[PDB]
Design a binder for this molecule. Structure first.
Ligand SMILES: Cc1[nH]c2c(F)cc(Br)cc2c1CCN
Ligand SMILES: [Ca+2]
Length: 223
């Protein structure tokens, strides 16, 4: 996250770190057994880390649970990033509490101008590279479809939205991938892609979660 703030320990209790020897992506806990992330975060050997603040220090509220199965969306295209969503099932159910909690799925899509909270352990620099230890947060509005398409001609599908600031300076970044965009208490987005981080006229692009709720629910129901 570039231009954000330190969230505070366990204040984003649905935020997960995906670890394969090291943090490589975020995700969102959606019930005791399932995490939502980005399809471009797929790899094998994933351990889900819940209750994290400093990802380099065991502080006492973590739960470390290996993935038993990952399911990349059937229509994910890795060239265009269309349908950039994945589900990860945990080998055992997480223990839910104030600091480890699921985030509700949307019942309808969100509107331009809605305020959202984006969070992650990604790069905090727009030029250069610095990776934080503690969770970072950014409040950012959803941008109009027309602004989003103007920023990225020919690249924005019906499964994507932009959020952030056209002036630059505040954005998600590398390593925030797969993490949450939460708006009015619902998981509306997944950190997906962009051109650089926090660059003028290049806001972040996010998977439009509301288009996937039927698939998420029926996947969970049979897996
Ligand atoms: C999700 C993602 N991953 C990135 C990456 F690996 C390198 C760079 Br430069 C940008 C990004 C973004 C977009 C952030 N709005
Ligand atoms: Ca920790």
């Amino acid at each position: 996250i570039v231009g954000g703030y330190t969230c505070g320990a366990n204040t984003v209790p649905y935020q997960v770190s995906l670890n394969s020897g090291y943090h490589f992506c975020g995700g969102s806990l959606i019930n005791s057994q399932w995490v939502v992330s980005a399809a471009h975060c797929y790899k094998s050997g994933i351990q889900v880390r819940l209750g994290e603040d400093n990802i380099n220090v065991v502080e006492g509220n973590e739960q470390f649970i290996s993935a038993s199965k990952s399911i990349v969306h059937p229509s994910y295209n890795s060239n265009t990033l269309n349908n950039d969503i994945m589900l990860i099932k945990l080998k055992s159910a997480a223990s839910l509490n104030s600091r480890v909690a699921s985030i509700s799925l949307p019942t309808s899509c969100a509107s331009a101008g809605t305020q959202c909270l984006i969070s992650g352990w990604g790069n905090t620099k727009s030029s250069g590279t610095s990776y934080p230890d503690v969770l970072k947060c950014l409040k950012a509005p959803i941008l109009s479809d027309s602004s989003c398409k103007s920023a990225y001609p020919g690249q924005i599908t019906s499964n994507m939205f932009c959020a952030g600031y056209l002036e630059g300076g505040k954005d998600s970044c590398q390593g925030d991938s797969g993490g949450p965009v939460v708006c009015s208490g619902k998981l509306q987005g997944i950190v997906s892609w962009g051109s650089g981080c926090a660059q003028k006229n290049k806001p972040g692009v996010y998977t439009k979660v509301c288009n996937y709720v039927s698939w998420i629910k029926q996947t969970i129901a049979s897996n």
